């Protein structure tokens, strides 16, 4: 990293929109990453800061940045139920089938926590329903392991 | 009583000497300490879970213990933190006055019932229960200047050779080692383990089996066979004692018959029990001891004894081993004793000077020089009687009692010299008459001064603990002063004073004294002339009195209040905080720069920097550190710019440029056992089951609102740490079962390699110590190392961790807080400039009331006490007023005349408020106690004026004005003598700079200001009080003389 | 049971001794560990110490080292007694 | 209170010198003291002197080769020769202990060691003489 | 012994001084107490 990179990261995590905008205006790197490879977009997707996500994307943030274990902001937003952020990310070109180092996709994550509406959005945008993580498991396998009957239906 | 001892001056001397004897004995035997117990008693439970994260610690240890912490007497609140180092501390704080030994025993008994519920690894570390509210007597550091020892070597030497001798020294009560005795460290290599189809499980099993101490019975053991001739012990396996013996533990015998020894899969070395803290003294590896005073011990005795014990070990130290003393409260305590004695010795000299200036003979001068030391010595015996100690507070109690003690001596002696001169009466008979005039009033004064000072002792909490010290000291000195004034000083007046010819006022003396006597006779005439004219139109001065009373109230309301002055204690701290996930090595560079700065740009002021990499006062962690700066003696640091406050601001400014970290310097509190005292201490509490993330959100909400009232609250901030990245690794149960890998082998391999594991004990040079297994560092650093660890399946195949695990980054807490058993987040803060912390606290609660449902709050620490002790000052002093009134009503046999004494109270207060306001000081406890001694003296002056006036009317028939004028003429000289001696005696305290000057300034300037206006104003005002009160409450003729 | 002196001392005596600090009014501590499998650790306190307090504080420190003792020693029961009082009487019992 | 006559001296190992060196130092001090009989008399140790003990070494390699576990070995030796508290039983209504120990005649002399067998993983009975050696040495019957 | 040998002379210095003081009050004299205190060896020699 470097100077204004670090202030943007903490700004995106804390949810300080005006300051994100100010640091943008001053030439801060939208794609500045910390030690684990999280960008401001990672941070804002994880903490659910929808407006910061938009502002970062409007300013050319890599929508498909991956951390050191291969996870993208879409993974985070889908895993922790941030539906509106999942739509914004997909609208801006987020790889709906991105896999982390474990073969895990946003659909696996959304399915594992039961976020039915996120699962439908991801499917609408072309999520491979038969995608398998490193253990051979699909979102369907996840659904029936969780006993989530509604999800199990939707995932054919 | 005075008549009895006038006729027996040797019996009087004998009582004085026995009093002095009892006091000197007390001084050789009383505990000495900087402060008495002031913090509420706290008990701390500490436990350790090696390799555990904060949430694991809290949910397997903290909550289990907390749920058993009920049914404990006098508990005020409980708080805990559980952190990423595997450590939990639960602090239970008890009401002031709780027996801390009982509180500890009850906590221990509740804890011991939850012990079987704790993980075995936590039980094996030892769960300690300690009294944690006492503070360090001294911190000993230990270095090796030869450069030949790591901190682990130094800690082992301290643990094995020094720690217990210290613990055994006279007056020591607790001892904390900076580090650990050696542990046997097995550093595993996962490549070599896999090569031989082995895991940490097999290593741990082989150590337990081959590092064992076996009970084997005896040859010829009982019950024996008939005819047995031999009895002998069977000795089987014994604990291993060396790295070599651990290395040849046999793990395995291969197929070809070759041997896999422990040293073929691990490095083996004596090392530390853990490695979270790097300790350095002036940049060299260090260990040390934190030493606490035993309850009721003499601190001066213990420090000397500790230093002697370490001197006697010094010849048997390994070459280079050096003891250092970065912290020791003993020197500061000695300065306090010396400054107080200095103040007493010179107050006696000043009384000599004033006594000679006015009474002009050396015989009269000897009597206060005798009586005052008798009362001070004797006061120690009364303190010994009540269990008190010689401390900063009791000693300043005695310098505050000088004015009252000196006054008793002057009042007795000056009155006999006046009776002799006005009446030509011989010594013995003038003392009998003079004592008859003052004796009843001296006893009423003793009651009245008890009602002034005793209610103080009933304040609650920490402040009451401080006041109680002043209250008991001053009352005991005062009572003893009255006894001595009824026994010894009359007998000394009757036998040492030489007669004065009637009407002789020394006006016919030559030289300076004759000038003085003619000037002071003139002045008394102007004074009584002035009072006469004032008495002609009393209404105008009743309006002036009201102006003074309103001005006092105005000044009082605007004087900022505070707790105890900050002191330059010769030591301060500098905090180091690095970003999330920052490593020990990165924190060490910042501490090195901090250490370099102090030993370079502050070389003249700094003696040492004791830097601790791995803990701070926000919490523990690789990204946190503290440097404790010990300064050269105050003597070698002359100047405002070389005091702690100035050094601290320069350092903080200099460290503003450090980019890797937040680095802040700051002074210690006056009472480090209590801390802060400035500001408030807020607890946000999860009272539904909202969970940590929701609690942080609520906390951030409250913090944002608070920053939007910067006119009310400033610097409101979390006390703890923010969430940090963590590595979340999921074990796939299905794949493990498919491969035939058991979950116990999986979790034990991961835990032992990456967190380390306490296996069992061994014997190192005769002493039992621990064995720990852990991966060598280079195979446990980054996520890619996870896959180099193999676990053996049931079918014997080696399976890499990558086959049955997945992982991801997430956020979680490095330090979880709980308050009274519920998840909590502590918020510090303070009232904005010129605002009351009591009102800042009201805003905090109003903001808090808007937070999401299920979030609640509570106040702790100094703020808890405030909310339970604000209603005290007016009611405790209503009580004091009423009892003073009642005592005065008995003394004068009147319901109205007490008002002419009680109205002098604002006269000293306005000068105290003026002196503190001008000097920019605060209404702190030293100011408050000075107020009561000033009020005490002023009331005593009025009581004797009014007593003389009333007696002149009652037993000599004089009318109101003649009696009032004559009383005021007689009382002028002793009032001025006491006030000149006391004001001078307190001047060194007002201008004091240096060691302890914060306290001395505080007692000095309110007292000096109060003394000035009390005397100047009372000698004109209490005649007005007496005349208007006598005129308003009356019936038949009293303006005119009668028979 | 069945332990030699060195085994007793190095698995029981030292473990307990290392936890015998932070006790009020302790003058000295002594112990012996012998071939019968027995250890006695005697802590002696200043004259005037409340012996009930001294016992309670010793017991509390001991009880923290208990999980470190071999299970066979825990199962025998580790007693903590005031040992400075003397025998009022000794009763013997025989069968004639 | 006891004695009251005389003195009560403690010699203390303050480096890690160990018991044998401490006995030597003690014997040194006792010899000197006996050479001032005008000053000190009857200065003597309060405790006991070192006595022969039977030191038995278990060979870890041979045990592993035979498939005999060390736990079965040490438990067989300890329970038979030292005895072992197993659990509790009820005797006429009152709870009391159960102890297992060898009958006296099989636990008296070194030759008895070899009459004790431990079962290997493969089910064979292995005599203690197969995986152990022993020697006489000196050690303390009472450590202070 | 090593913590209580300095006691007998100082504890009895104290006793001497207080006896003197008590005698001085009884007789209203600093000197007459000596004519009592000097009897102390007279009983001690017979005991010895
Ligand atoms: C604040 N404190 C007393 C210090 C200061 C400097 C230090 O260098 C250290 C400590 C704590 C001590 C506690 C000791 C403890 N014990 C007395 C051996 C201990 O069991 C632990 C533990 N939590 O496992 C340590 O951290 C510890 O080994 C340790 O490494 C310390 C340490 O390194």
Residue numbers in the entry:
A (entry chain B): 11 to 166
B (entry chain A): 1 to 1043
C (entry chain A): 50 to 145
D (entry chain A): 674 to 817
E (entry chain A): 866 to 913
Original authors' sentences:
Resistance nodulation and cell division (RND) efflux pumps are secondary active antiporters that are ubiquitous across all domains of life. As part of tripartite multidrug efflux systems in Gram-negative bacteria, they span the entire cell envelope and export a broad variety of structurally and chemically unrelated toxic substrates. During drug efflux, AcrB undergoes a functional rotation where each of the three protomers sequentially cycles through the conformational states loose (L), tight (T) and open (O). Substrates can enter the PD through several channels and bind to the access pocket (AP) in the L state and the deep binding pocket (DBP) in the T state.
To assess this, we solved the co-structures of V612F and V612W in complex with minocycline via X-ray crystallography. The introduced F or W side chain is sandwiched between the reoriented F615 and F610, forming a stack of aromatic rings, and closes off the groove of the DBP, thus reducing its size. Minocycline is shifted in the binding pocket to avoid steric overlap with the introduced F or W at position 612. The V612 variant co-structures demonstrate the plasticity of the DBP that is able to accommodate the ligand and allows the formation of alternative interactions despite the alterations in the binding network. In contrast to wildtype AcrB, that crystallises in the LLL and LTO states, the V612F/W crystal structures were exclusively obtained in the TTT state.
